[PDB]
Design a binder for this molecule. Structure first.
Ligand SMILES: [Cl-]
Length: 108
């Protein structure tokens, strides 16, 4: 489960990535969880299974969605409460939900 976060690797987002990594390890989940600035998404999206945007870059969703949909990568904006309260277990769940729903047997 590879989870790409956009669009900054500042204190807050990086703290969340660390918490998301602790949560994934504690479910013996292998994969890469990493944050990049917006200019790096194109070169990192193919490795990702899910792309998650910080609440402060919600305005980039429409444009990032076109790319993600095209690449078969789940995409969503992180819930402001999960982000502000640094709930890594919750954001990992969000990502897992996007990936699972995305492969849903009935259609797409
Ligand atoms: Cl950054």
């Amino acid at each position: 489960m590879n989870i790409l976060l956009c669009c900054s690797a500042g204190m807050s987002t990086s703290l969340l990535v660390t918490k998301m990594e602790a949560a994934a390890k504690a479910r013996g989940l292998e994969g890469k969880i990493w944050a990049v600035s917006g200019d790096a998404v194109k070169t990192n999206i193919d490795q990702a299974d899910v792309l998650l945007l910080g609440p402060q870059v919600r305005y980039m969703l429409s444009s990032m969605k076109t790319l993600a949909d095209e690449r078969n990568v789940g995409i969503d904006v992180i819930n402001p409460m999960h982000y502000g309260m640094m709930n890594g277990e919750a954001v990992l769940d969000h990502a897992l939900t996007l990936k699972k729903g995305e492969n849903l047997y009935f259609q797409s």
